[PDB]
């Protein structure tokens, strides 16, 4: 029922690593401050996403048992989760509580950033469905770890080794769901259910980026490796 001393140690360690990320307020203050052109926003995106990959590699390396896994499986896990992790992180920031009108302005500024209409609705639909779970910082941190350590990712040679690392994180999240939401015993499965809608973003990330209303889609050598653009 309650977290064991080992699980509490694990949760605090995941939290410290997750807190090493770019501050959510810094990101929203910039978007809310002034409206930018589609070219300016594409460049902001390119810089934010490059930094995110760097932070994600550091977060991943600290995941218990990750560095004991086969090197090629390590690359396969990172490539498989990078885009999902950025959308989960973007979903977290989008649902952070702000003063009156700010969230409507944030949404309107993102809606006009340059992305094609085709991708705006599937994106805000995912963000709002994330918000309905009223997730805590710990739930976001554990879900990111769970997303990274997915055994059913393509090109993984040893699934069972990945399975063994994901299982203790799934147990910690399950216990937190029961503690944080005792009235709703469905909460854990609802949280896991959101991972399938996250997976759909991998199929159309490349198009979502190429369809951006800009004359030239210039990416960084790190984004070219992780995104396949």
């Amino acid at each position: 029922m309650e977290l064991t001393p080992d699980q509490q140690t694990l949760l605090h360690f995941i939290m410290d690593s997750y807190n090493k990320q770019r501050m959510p307020q810094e990101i929203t203050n910039k978007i809310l401050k002034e409206a930018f052109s589609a070219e300016e926003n594409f460049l902001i995106l390119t810089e934010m996403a490059t930094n995110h990959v760097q932070v994600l590699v550091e977060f991943t390396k600290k995941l218990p048992g990750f560095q004991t896994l086969d090197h090629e499986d390590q690359i396969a896990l990172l490539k498989g989760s990078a885009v999902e992790a950025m959308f989960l992180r973007s979903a977290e920031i989008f649902n952070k509580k702000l003063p009156s009108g700010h969230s409507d302005l944030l949404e309107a500024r993102i809606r006009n950033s340059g992305i094609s209409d085709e991708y705006i609705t599937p994106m805000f639909s995912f963000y709002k469905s994330i918000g309905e779970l009223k997730m805590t910082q710990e739930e976001y941190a554990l879900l990111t770890a769970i997303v990274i350590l997915s055994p059913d990712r393509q090109y993984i040679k040893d699934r069972e080794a990945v399975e063994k690392l994901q299982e203790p994180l799934l147990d910690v999240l399950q216990k937190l769901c029961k503690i944080h939401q005792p009235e709703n015993p469905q909460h854990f499965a609802c949280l896991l259910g959101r991972l399938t809608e996250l997976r759909t973003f991998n199929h159309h990330h490349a198009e979502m980026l190429m369809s951006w209303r800009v004359n030239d889609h210039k990416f960084t050598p790190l984004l070219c490796e992780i995104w396949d653009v």
């Binding site: 390396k61 090197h71 690359i75 050598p221 490796e225």
Partner: peptide, 11 residues
Amino acid sequence: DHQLLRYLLDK
């Protein structure tokens, strides 16, 4: 193939 990713991983 994934040179930068591998580099950041093996650091």
